[PDB]
Design a protein around this ligand. Structure first.
Ligand code: K
Ligand code: K
Ligand code: K
Ligand code: MG
Ligand code: MG
Ligand code: MG
Ligand code: MG
Ligand code: MG
Ligand code: MG
Ligand code: MG
Ligand code: MG
Ligand code: MG
Ligand code: MG
Ligand code: MG
Ligand code: MG
Ligand code: MG
Ligand code: MG
Ligand code: MG
Ligand code: MG
Ligand code: MG
Ligand code: MG
Ligand code: MG
Ligand code: NA
Ligand code: NA
Ligand code: NA
Ligand code: NA
Ligand code: NA
Ligand code: NA
Ligand code: NA
Ligand code: NA
Ligand code: NA
Ligand code: NA
Ligand code: NA
Ligand code: NA
Lengths: 260, 184, 163, 73
RNA sequence: GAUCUGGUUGAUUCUGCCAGUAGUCAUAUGCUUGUUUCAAGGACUUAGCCAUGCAUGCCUCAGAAUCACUGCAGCAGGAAUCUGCGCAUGGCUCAUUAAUCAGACGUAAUCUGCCGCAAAAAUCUUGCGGCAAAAUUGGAUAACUUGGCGAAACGCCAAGCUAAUACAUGAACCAACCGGGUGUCUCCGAGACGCCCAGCGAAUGAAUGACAAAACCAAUGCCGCAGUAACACCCAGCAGUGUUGACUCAAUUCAUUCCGUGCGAAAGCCGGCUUCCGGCGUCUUUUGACGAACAACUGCCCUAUCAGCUGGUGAUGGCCGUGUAGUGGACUGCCAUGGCGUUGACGGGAGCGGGGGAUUAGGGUUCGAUUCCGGAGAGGGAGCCUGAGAAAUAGCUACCACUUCUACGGAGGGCAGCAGGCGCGCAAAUUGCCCAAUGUCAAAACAAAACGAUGAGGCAGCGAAAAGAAAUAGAGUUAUUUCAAUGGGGGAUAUUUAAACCCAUCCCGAGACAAUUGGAGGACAAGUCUGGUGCCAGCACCCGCGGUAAUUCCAGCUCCAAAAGCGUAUAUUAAUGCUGUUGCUGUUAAAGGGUUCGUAGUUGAACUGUGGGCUGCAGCCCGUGAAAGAAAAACACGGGAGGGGUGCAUGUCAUGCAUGCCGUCCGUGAUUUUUUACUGUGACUAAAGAAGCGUGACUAAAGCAGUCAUGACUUGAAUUAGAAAGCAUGGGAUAACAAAGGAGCUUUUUAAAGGUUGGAGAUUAUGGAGCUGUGCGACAAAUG
RNA sequence: AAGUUCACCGAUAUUUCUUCAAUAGAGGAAGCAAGUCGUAACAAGGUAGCUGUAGGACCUGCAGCUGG
RNA sequence: GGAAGUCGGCAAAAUAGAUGCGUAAGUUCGCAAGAAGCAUUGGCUCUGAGGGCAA
């Protein structure tokens, strides 16, 4: 039904100025949700600064020069999302979309043999025709023969270049997770104990590396490794460590004083 | 046209609602089918989403299953004998779900003899599995009594005006005795 | 329509428009600093009021509070940068003693007068408006320019000026 | 809630009583609401008893809840 | 900044109102306005009527060209038409409406084009005259030509040509695994062979979709019962194991109809290598995402000179059905007599709802047609087609009210889209330029013969709404002459801009380029100045001036307040403890009912509790008794634990390539276990707006940028509050709800009588364990 | 394809009833703002005043109050 | 066509049974009231409801 998107109604995760135009590009249906996605036109023009306007952003995309998960995408309304690999072979830059500690979208540089895998969270399991088991991930993928020990909430390590799963990480006590929603988004913690309330939401308690304690809904956690030491994915610079605003304000004042 | 909304109904307090919006296409209804006995005649209806419904107008054939033996056969409908809503539907001979009908008993008698070797098979031959399955197996007298008469009561289990079929199941047990008392 | 630029007001007319004690006190300030109209004085009254209410709310209601360490040193940094407060004094109670003349001192028109470049406040006004004065090699034409203490020793004549 | 009337067939009326707070006067206010519930034959509640009800699909014009438990008196 | 002043008396102290005073992105009007930046703008009255013009179309290397089309040399560009997609979005308005909306939620009651990741083994076709194998399939229609009808009509007729990714038809062997039913052969029940049916999806019926100690008989496996997933050979582990809080759901097997709504390898189109290598496009099945429809947990104006409303005439519920995409009195038949209401139903009246704006010490009062979100409408009222989606209106049909052209036969219209008019009013712009930016659509990247549309949107004009910055000089000389500086203004190789504009930058130019609007008794700053008039003219928001000496009228001079602004009118906030919860009055100023009884409602007495010992440190069975017994526990689940802690065997017809060297975790059944409210934490909680972190856009109103030297700052864009309702959990002092009304109120110990056997199918006895009539030993008892 | 018959949704018109808001009218009644005829009240106001009621500026009877 | 006839609707016409719905001012609360007004009705073939005495 709806086809437009006003700029004021657009998500604040993007950085769009209210005084520049009335409209924002409406993402198409696809792998990721509208409210938790970054369209390809925003990445090319507003973040990488490769395109000065939206006319030049169409020249780059309709030539198939941008590959997402080892596949060209020529739609500027394509909804790229969490744990996605973006590669531009002409410029030789590879990125991964993650959340920083504050909660904003972050592009993390990657290298070869690391830009070949991605992590997917299982959200549903069902039996298809012929009695085959199928698992649905958080980005729309459908795996037709998962590990027999796979369960809802676990993380599957995928190989985008060759298209088979390589490993499985289970979700239970004593594991490393990253929060992907709420007020604690982008914080890397460690599962302590999960409360199970049938019919309602489940609450998970996590402790940071520094020892800070926090909680969030169980649907907002994403297992990424056995513990904080051996993570299976490169994280942004702060390593999911939230700092006090009082100290934060002080260092920037000192650093800028000596910046000149 | 016809609508299925609650805007024209009174509130539980007895008051009247002031309608301030026009009728929407999403809440429409359609006229009934009033299926009847006779030679087959159906008409398709395009429903929401592009799907199709088969509105049957006349039918005289259907699929009826013997639940005890877990079999089924295609037979011909003979008459309508009972309707719980109103006996004016029995007079008009309309076919709806859960109505009671009488179907042809000839195909079921033939399968009975071919399986259990009982006639209500020219040569016995080596085929003597009849005694193999006739043990620990009995047939109620009520079912067998009307099998030799020529017709057997059945219950319609499908919605003829929504799918265009009249499929059913044979009455047995306490359900059979319930309806045999009303019909007398 | 569909415009989201913001705007607000900066001054406020006084109640009781005919107080004798207020009328003569404002006339001393207007002629001492060379101001053009009473709207300049009423503008300073508004910013001074905003400073006081922030401190009074922050002073004792929240006690030692993360909302007191924050924007408790920011105001002092703001006050010390422009010169509205004494360096020795570093408690929020001492910002409540700020007066209108103190803020009026740290004006570009006043600073030029006390620096010896201009003989009188009215002469300083015409110099700034004539683009004969620059701060850090930048021409300034606004007599309301609040000079920061860091740029105090940077104010001089303009290179492009005949002076 | 509490059973209020059992004069129908496989249907009861329950009432919920609560206090509403008026901010201006800083005082409370007695209010109530009435719901129509379907009573299964497995239960035999009397007027004044306390019941636990759970939400289901529309079963009639007014019924949207089902009785799940009954506490004597 | 938590503030007041004048008026009732001859004076005085009160109650009480009137008047003064400040604000308003609140309008209108009058007199004035040098410069610049930023902005609202026919809502109010008439959801009144509208001439004219424009507002939605789309072609790439990649769906159909024989233009009787254009270049040159078959190539290229190709008008027009068929085909596929879109036109259900955007824009405008606020008439209706007590539901709609806000926060929070359900669909396990459902539909879903474009987009993402997936799946696919039915269907005897073709050529030849039984043999072959890369399927060389068929009919018709536009554009076009001919003849035309009509006054015209986004009006029409007939004949003749021919395309497809339009329409229709249709592919055997390559090519497997598995199952059900049945006829003739061999061995003694086993095997072989022949035949019928066995694909995705749909309807009906039947199963699966788990559980939580020995003898006897018939048939069976292995050496007589020790090993022991299951299974009569090719396969010796080719599923004994779906998900959820929960399912008649997912999925599998059997039977009948299927298919009697459906299902092509588009019988499709382009390139690169020398034949296979890619890029597109399309049908069916399934579930993510984007949506749609339905449902209701708490909140939501005034009115009693509106107290009863509904009632098989559907009102509340039940049964079987119909209809729907789906649940449902949504609807047909039958049955019962219910549902709502002084905690305000029903009726009447004014209003679209929020985020939010104004003002305010706190508590509050008031506004919200208008930029973002939701709802509704397109002159009024109905009905419908196409489509994934409409009860569509720059779609169709009919009626009513207006209205246009005509040759009188007939045919048309819908500006609450953008500009423009007429009326209406106290009240609101140009019949302008452009797709350069932001977006939408789509057969689509830009360039090359070769430029998609867009009154959405942008940007100029008009425009003292409102909001920032700022000109109308400066320094001296003896009162009257000396300097310097220039901005308005006029120009510029130029800059800006889609082109313009503005702005910035540079340069011929002064001491008329000359500021107004209200006042001068008091409130309230400022004349005892001078003429004229004489209760006349007039002033005066209130008190009050004028009757021949006017502090107030009409003028001159002087002075006062604000100043490029200043008066007047009408609404609103504050002043106002003059609506009083915080926080008002009631003897005499306004106001206690003539006196009682009484129902909803509001309010309601005390009690179940000093812990001790050695400001601290650590410990106590934390009154007294009595020392494993005594004052969440306890059975059972290997389909529970990536069966958790505390080279030698085993097999070998093995891809066995394997296998081993006391409290918790999970799920199930029994046992009695107490809420609400208040309070402390935690989770979840659109932007814009408000509070504020950083930053010299020359300052500011703003904005989120920027700063430093083939690039760095890993640049930055931090945080906070947001009614009520809902979720999890800790505490028990003050309270609430519910129940009773006080005479419906031992344990333990043995003895006695009774009523897993290899597996699968029947039969039997014993033993549990409970249940009674006995007997026995021990221990308590809050009342011998 | 046109065309018969029935059921359903139902514009429009006519008539009858309910509710809300406005409207004319000979003639009568009742208030407010700007010459004559009498003093009912204020002093014991020249009959002390006042409240309810009944009858004929007001007067009289009955019961009450002091605001005598 | 519809009282224009005539002193005057005199005389004639006109309404009409039963059942369902509906019904004004006024009032001595009994009435006014069959106020006024609107709808249905045949024939045929069927269905449902309404009882007694004998075990
Ligand atoms: K109402
Ligand atoms: K454009
Ligand atoms: K007198
Ligand atoms: Mg200069
Ligand atoms: Mg077409
Ligand atoms: Mg719209
Ligand atoms: Mg517009
Ligand atoms: Mg085949
Ligand atoms: Mg039903
Ligand atoms: Mg309101
Ligand atoms: Mg809107
Ligand atoms: Mg217009
Ligand atoms: Mg105007
Ligand atoms: Mg516009
Ligand atoms: Mg004067
Ligand atoms: Mg004075
Ligand atoms: Mg009084
Ligand atoms: Mg009248
Ligand atoms: Mg007297
Ligand atoms: Mg007549
Ligand atoms: Mg005559
Ligand atoms: Mg007569
Ligand atoms: Na200028
Ligand atoms: Na209007
Ligand atoms: Na408007
Ligand atoms: Na096709
Ligand atoms: Na509103
Ligand atoms: Na509409
Ligand atoms: Na239009
Ligand atoms: Na082009
Ligand atoms: Na401009
Ligand atoms: Na007020
Ligand atoms: Na006050
Ligand atoms: Na903001």
């Amino acid at each position: 039904a709806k086809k437009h998107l006003k700029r004021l109604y657009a998500p604040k995760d993007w950085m769009l100025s209210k005084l520049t135009g009335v409209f924002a590009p409406r993402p198409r249906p696809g792998p990721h949700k509208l409210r938790e996605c970054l369209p390809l036109l925003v990445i090319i023009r507003n973040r990488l600064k490769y395109a000065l306007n939206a006319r030049e952003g169409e020249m780059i995309l309709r030539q198939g020069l941008v590959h997402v998960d080892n596949h060209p995408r020529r739609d500027g309304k394509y909804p790229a999302g969490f744990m996605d690999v973006v590669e531009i072979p002409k410029t030789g830059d590879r990125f991964r979309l993650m959340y920083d500690v504050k909660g904003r979208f972050a592009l993390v540089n990657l290298s070869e043999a690391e830009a070949q895998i991605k992590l997917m969270k299982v959200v549903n399991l069902y039996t298809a025709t012929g009695r085959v088991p199928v698992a649905v991930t958080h980005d729309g993928h459908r795996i037709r023969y998962p590990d027999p020990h796979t369960s809802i909430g676990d993380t599957i390590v995928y190989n985008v270049k060759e298209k088979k799963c390589v490993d499985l990480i289970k979700n239970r006590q004593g594991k490393a997770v990253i929060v992907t929603g709420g007020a604690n988004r982008g914080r890397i913690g460690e599962i302590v104990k999960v409360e199970c309330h049938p019919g309602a939401f489940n609450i998970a308690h996590l402790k940071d590396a520094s020892g800070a304690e926090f909680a969030t809904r169980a649907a907002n956690i994403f297992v990424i490794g056995k513990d904080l030491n051996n993570l299976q994915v490169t994280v942004p610079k702060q390593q999911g460590l939230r700092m006090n605003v009082i100290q934060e304000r002080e260092e920037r004042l000192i650093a800028a004083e000596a910046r000149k | 046209g016809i609508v299925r909304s609650r805007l024209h109904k009174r509130k539980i307090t007895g008051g009247k609602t002031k309608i301030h919006r026009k009728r929407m296409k999403a809440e429409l209804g359609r006229l009934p089918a009033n299926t009847r006995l006779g030679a087959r005649r159906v008409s398709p209806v395009r429903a929401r989403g592009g799907n199709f419904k088969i509105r049957a107008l006349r039918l005289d054939t259907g699929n009826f299953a013997w639940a005890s033996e877990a079999i089924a056969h295609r037979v011909r409908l003979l008459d309508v004998v009972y309707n719980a809503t109103s006996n004016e539907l029995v007079r008009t001979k309309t076919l709806v779900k859960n109505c009671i009908v009488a179907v042809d008993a000839a195909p079921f008698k033939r399968w009975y003899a071919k399986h259990y070797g009982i006639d209500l098979k020219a040569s016995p031959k080596l085929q003597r599995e009849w005694t193999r399955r006739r043990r620990n197996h009995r047939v109620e007298k009520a079912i067998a009594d009307q099998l030799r008469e020529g017709r057997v009561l059945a219950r319609i289990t499908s919605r003829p005006g929504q799918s265009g079929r009249a499929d059913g199941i044979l009455l047995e047990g306490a359900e059979l005795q319930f309806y045999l008392k009303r019909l007398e | 329509m569909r415009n989201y630029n913001n705007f607000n007001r900066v001054w406020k007319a006084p109640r009781r428009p005919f107080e004798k004690e207020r009328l003569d006190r404002e006339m001393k300030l207007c002629g001492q600093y060379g101001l053009r109209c009473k709207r300049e004085i009423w503008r300073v009254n508004m910013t001074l009021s905003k400073m006081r209410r922030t401190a009074r709310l922050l002073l004792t209601l929240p006690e030692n509070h993360p909302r007191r360490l924050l924007e408790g040193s920011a105001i002092m940094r703001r006050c010390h940068e422009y010169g509205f407060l004494d360096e020795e004094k570093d408690k929020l109670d001492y910002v409540l003693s700020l007066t209108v003349p103190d803020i009026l001192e740290r004006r570009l028109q006043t600073i030029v007068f006390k620096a010896g470049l201009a003989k009188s406040v009215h002469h300083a006004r015409v110099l700034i408006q004539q683009r004969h004065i620059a701060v850090a090699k930048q021409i300034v034409t606004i007599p309301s320019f609040i000079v920061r203490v860091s740029s105090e020793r940077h104010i001089a004549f303009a290179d492009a000026s005949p002076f | 809630g509490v059973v209020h009337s059992t004069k129908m067939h496989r249907t009861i009326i329950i009432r919920r009583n609560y206090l509403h707070f008026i901010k201006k006067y800083q005082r409370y206010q007695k209010r109530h609401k009435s719901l129509a519930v379907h009573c299964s034959p497995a239960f035999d509640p009397k007027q004044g008893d306390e019941v636990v009800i759970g939400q289901c699909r529309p079963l009639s014009k007014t019924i949207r809840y089902n009785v799940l438990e009954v506490v004597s008196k």
